[PDB]
Design a protein around this ligand. Structure first.
Ligand SMILES: CSc1ccccc1CC(=O)N1C[C@@H](C)C[C@H](C(N)=O)C1
Ligand SMILES: [Zn+2]
Length: 139
């Protein structure tokens, strides 16, 4: 679990969005596993606008943060799950690090701000949905 709170927006994994997220929908994209909903309270986070490929993510299944080197956002095949059919997920960045399904939502940050959230993983892999291209989250 986990969310980014920026301005009057809440960014979550689309597959973990609540009834309230859908009732306050701003934008969603199944191909990116992202959903953004509106909030009444002002957020606590700021978004990176950069090309970093290193950062630190929060891993809930270890109650710890880990440093990572990750690929640039790209279109990557993701096998079928309970939430989606087998498909290509776009704007996904992969890295070597620990993750389990419940780790989705953990934030990845670089020195400039929030980069994205955990969205996929595998045997010693962790994948992050990028949010740096969503300029309207502040603008
Ligand atoms: C951190 S998720 C994870 C970690 C280790 C092993 C397996 C997973 C599960 C995983 O990759 N997916 C299943 C589900 C959570 C939806 C995800 C998606 N964005 O399509 C894909
Ligand atoms: Zn950066």
């Amino acid at each position: 679990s986990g969310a980014i709170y920026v301005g009057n927006y809440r960014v979550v994994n689309r597959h973990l969005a609540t009834h309230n997220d859908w009732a306050n929908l701003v934008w969603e994209d199944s191909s990116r596993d992202l959903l953004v909903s509106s909030t009444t309270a002002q957020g606590c986070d700021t978004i990176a606008r950069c090309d970093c490929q290193t950062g630190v993510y929060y891993c809930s299944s270890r109650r710890k943060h880990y440093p990572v080197s990750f690929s640039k956002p790209s279109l990557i095949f993701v096998e079928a799950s309970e939430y989606y059919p087998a498909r290509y997920q776009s704007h996904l960045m992969l890295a070597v690090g620990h993750s389990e399904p419940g780790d989705c939502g953990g934030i990845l940050r670089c020195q400039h701000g929030v980069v994205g959230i955990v969205s996929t993983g595998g045997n010693g892999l962790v994948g992050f949905a990028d949010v740096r291209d969503l300029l309207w989250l502040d603008e």
